[PDB]
Design a protein around this ligand. Structure first.
Ligand SMILES: C[S@@+](CC[C@H](N)C(=O)[O-])C[C@H]1O[C@@H](n2cnc3c(N)ncnc32)[C@H](O)[C@@H]1O
Lengths: 129, 33, 225, 260
DNA sequence: TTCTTAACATCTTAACTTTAAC
DNA sequence: GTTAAAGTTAAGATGTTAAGAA
């Protein structure tokens, strides 16, 4: 018979016994977590968490949004680092204290990408001003 | 200071964390005097 | 020092710009699908060994392969990360394996107790492989010790059941691994090559593992992993 | 230059270890030649020694000559023969656990290990053929200390005939005998626990005169008080059982022979 | 008080700097 | 301006043994 090819077999084991943060869909190693150090990966649960938490709460102050959050692996510096991409712009000083829903956030993200492409200075989705 | 924060064995996100920490401390100092 | 440290503030703001750009580039490469050094056929588990139930591993392996494990590696966190010399024995290795091998890495202070542990589980002492530490120039890396200058790390091999079958090739590799130091406590990668010379196409289980090895077809129980 | 070579850089204590000549004055060396330790009485030819050596040729396979564990089971060791000493015994891995428990029943606790890594002279000659003087015997390599160049020493290990991981090792199990009252005087770390020794193929069970000098000197430095100096006359505090002809007649040692 | 348990006991190599020629 | 000798230093999965917490 077949000598137990290991791809789908390992996929089934990762479905069964491995951690939920290592396998996505049916079978995937989730390489984005084995190249980053332990405790800091920003799971899709965290992504949706801050995506739903940037609204209905005062932006700028991340202590008050982290008090009602997990209060775990949610350090502030990662929050200001990864909220920039949701905005699309590195600078946040002009975008303090105002709340914008997710679809308009994606709209202004696309607008920032387009203006960076037209201004031929984009550096991997990141626009500087 | 600037060197131990810039260590290569230090992971980059924690480099950002401690480096932001000394920015906060020094701007608190300029707030002081 | 107000103006000088204001210039230092400008310097670390340039550091903000450089480091934010560097991490944004690396994270964009991550989201683009950058592959880590880990192989796609690695089966990891992040749970405490004294806490997890191994019966789930047993019937998962029996369902997905139909056989039991071939090699159970372990490099225990010896008591001298603490554990004990009773909690290591009390965990169910004798059910995790039926016919195979076990590699238990021991220090010179934990030799007799390791031999007693292996003999208690049902294995019989068969072989020992030793890691000989090396320097970058090639000289032996000797350090510490009481009666002699230590340059050694031992590991003992226990065999449970029958070995005369298609797997488990005889007269392979060597029991002495002459290799450089590459960590505070990090065994060489030649032992894995020796294992794959011993049992090709196997279902190996490794306990007390770290993210350094995580090889192909390996079940890699650990906690900080 | 010999420095760049990995072989010649790993084997440089050879020129620094010359075993001394045979003792003559009849005070230095002792002989209690007899038929068998498990047959003769012991602890009456000597008393209260500090270094016990058993040069054992284990049989392993039944066809191969040697002795098995039952001789050590019936070995005559009392508190009179050795009370505070450390016992040095050559061990394999097939009977390592057996040696450990049979010496545990007498009170000797394992404290440390000291191994020798084999490097084959036949392997060096074959490699120098495969890469390229080099038309001489392996024993001549052992004698002249003429080591052909080799920057990778991990290929030069001996090829055994084991049914498992191939054998390239030689283990000396040293076991303490705790007394807690008379104690043992010792210096700590003036010896490495590994030394790469040159051997000969088809005969790995023989350590040469330089390796014997190394192990004897590490015993003698490990136990300085048992060195022959003004007080060991009749108080030798060192013997070797199953003594060999080479390097055993020693100033301060009792050579326990084995008559047929 | 008693067994542990903190709490003390030294050797080789590879690199890194500093200084004396030359 | 270059090469070599001397001081330095940092690291390498040791252990017996006086002291003392239950
Ligand atoms: C000394 S390391 C051995 C790792 C191995 N030498 C390697 O680098 O592949 C022991 C590891 O076991 C894990 N571990 C320690 N204590 C554990 C425990 N109580 N239960 C489960 N895993 C544990 C930790 O990840 C620790 O790093």
């Amino acid at each position: 018979n077949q000598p137990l090819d290991f791809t789908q077999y390992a996929k089934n084991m990762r479905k069964d016994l491995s951690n939920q943060d290592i396998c996505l869909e049916d079978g995937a190693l989730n390489h984005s977590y084995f190249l980053t150090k332990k405790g800091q990966y920003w799971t899709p649960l965290n992504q949706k968490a801050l995506q739903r938490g940037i609204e209905l709460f005062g932006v700028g102050n991340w202590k008050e949004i982290n008090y009602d959050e997990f209060s775990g692996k949610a350090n502030i510096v990662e929050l200001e680092l990864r909220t920039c991409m949701i905005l699309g712009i590195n600078d946040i000083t002009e975008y303090y204290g105002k709340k914008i829903s997710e679809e308009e956030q994606e709209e202004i993200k696309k607008s920032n990408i387009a203006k960076g492409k037209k201004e031929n200075k984009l550096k991997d989705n990141i626009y500087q001003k | 200071t600037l060197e131990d924060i810039e260590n290569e064995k230090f992971t980059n996100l924690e480099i950002l964390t401690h480096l932001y920490n000394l920015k906060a401390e020094i701007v608190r100092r300029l707030a002081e005097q | 020092s107000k103006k000088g440290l204001q210039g230092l503030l400008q310097d670390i703001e340039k550091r903000i710009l450089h480091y934010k750009q560097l991490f944004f580039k690396e994270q964009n490469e991550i989201a683009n699908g950058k592959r880590s050094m880990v192989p796609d056929n690695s089966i990891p588990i992040c749970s405490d060994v004294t806490k997890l139930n191994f019966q789930a591993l047993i019937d998962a392996q029996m369902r997905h392969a139909g056989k039991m494990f071939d090699v159970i590696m372990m490099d225990p966190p010896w008591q001298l990360d603490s554990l004990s010399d009773e909690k290591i024995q009390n965990m169910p290795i004798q059910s995790l394996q039926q016919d195979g091998f076990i590699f238990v890495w021991a220090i010179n202070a934990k030799y007799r107790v390791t031999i007693k542990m292996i003999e208690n589980w049902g294995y019989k002492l068969v072989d020992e492989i030793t890691w000989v530490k090396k320097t970058v120039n090639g000289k032996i890396a000797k350090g510490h010790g009481f009666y002699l200058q230590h340059a050694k790390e031992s590991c003992l091999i226990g065999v449970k059941g029958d070995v005369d079958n298609g797997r488990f090739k005889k007269n392979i590799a060597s029991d002495v691994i002459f290799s450089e130091r590459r960590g505070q406590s990090q065994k060489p990668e030649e032992i894995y090559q020796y294992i794959n010379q011993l049992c090709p196409n196997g279902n190996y289980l490794e306990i007390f593992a770290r993210r350094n090895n995580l090889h192909d077809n390996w079940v890699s129980i650990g906690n900080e992993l | 230059e010999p420095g760049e070579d990995q072989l010649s850089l790993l084997l440089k204590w050879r020129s620094s270890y010359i075993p001394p000549q045979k003792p003559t004055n009849e005070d230095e060396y002792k002989k209690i030649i007899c038929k068998d330790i498990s047959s003769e009485k012991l602890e009456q030819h000597a008393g209260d020694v500090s270094a016990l050596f058993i040069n054992i040729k284990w049989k392993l396979s039944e066809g191969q000559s040697g002795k098995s564990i039952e001789d050590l089971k019936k070995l005559a060791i009392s508190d009179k023969l050795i009370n505070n000493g450390i016992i040095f015994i050559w061990s394999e891995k097939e009977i390592l656990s057996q040696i450990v428990d049979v010496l545990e029943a007498k009170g000797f606790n394992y404290i440390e290990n000291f191994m020798i890594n084999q490097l084959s002279a036949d392997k060096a000659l074959e490699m120098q053929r495969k890469n390229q003087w080099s038309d001489i015997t392996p024993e001549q390599c052992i004698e002249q200390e003429k080591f052909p160049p080799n920057n990778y020493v991990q290929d030069i290990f001996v090829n055994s005939e084991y049914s498992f991981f191939r054998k390239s090792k030689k283990i000396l199990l040293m076991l303490r005998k705790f007394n807690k009252d008379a104690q043992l005087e010792l210096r700590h770390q003036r010896t490495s626990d590994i030394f790469f020794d040159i051997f000969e193929q088809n005969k790995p069970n023989d350590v040469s005169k330089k390796g014997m000098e190394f192990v004897y000197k590490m015993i003698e430095t490990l136990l300085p008080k048992a060195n022959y100096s003004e007080e060991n006359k009749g108080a030798f505090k060192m013997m070797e059982l199953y003594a060999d002809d080479k390097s055993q007649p020693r100033k301060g040692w009792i050579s326990v022979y084995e008559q047929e």
